[PDB]
Design a protein around this ligand. Structure first.
Ligand code: HEM
Length: 124
């Protein structure tokens, strides 16, 4: 027996070292989703142009690692739905991404910070 609850949560990805919107925000669907499944919380988000996202790690503001799983690597849509393990009360994630766009020889590693519109809630 398991139980799951979800609700939308919006967010903005911002540039390393500022609050300016990052280019990364344009490559993710909005809003995302908070899921609670058997008293574990996840932030679920969808990566657009998924083939460009070669690596993506998430951390909390204290540098703890946040396990990231892939729900659906949708090759037909070129999207990727991922779950990031979070805790209620988190307000922002640090992300470290490796983006590769082979046809323009673009191969970059970035740090950004993903700011939730409001802290991750407790769900019933
Ligand atoms: C998954 C796709 C992509 C992601 C996640 C992404 C993310 C980023 C990030 C995080 C930065 C650092 C500045 C910022 O935070 O906004 C950046 C820089 C940049 N990227 Fe990308 N990008 C993507 C695709 C592309 C593509 C397809 C191009 C085409 C050229 C591109 C061109 C650039 C340019 C021009 C900059 C800034 C260079 C400068 O500051 O002078 N990016 N990108």
């Amino acid at each position: 027996m398991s139980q799951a609850t979800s609700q939308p949560i919006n967010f903005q990805v911002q540039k390393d070292g500022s609050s300016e919107k990052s280019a990364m925000d344009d490559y993710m669907q909005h809003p995302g989703k908070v899921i609670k499944q058997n008293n574990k919380y996840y932030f679920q988000t969808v990566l657009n142009n998924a083939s460009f996202w070669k690596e993506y790690k998430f951390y909390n503001a204290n540098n703890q690692e946040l396990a990231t799983t892939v729900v659906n690597d949708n090759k037909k849509a070129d999207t990727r739905t991922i779950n990031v393990a979070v805790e209620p009360g988190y307000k922002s994630l640090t992300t470290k991404v490796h983006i590769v766009v082979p046809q323009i020889n673009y191969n970059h590693r970035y740090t950004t910070h993903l700011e939730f519109e409001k802290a991750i809630p407790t769900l019933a």
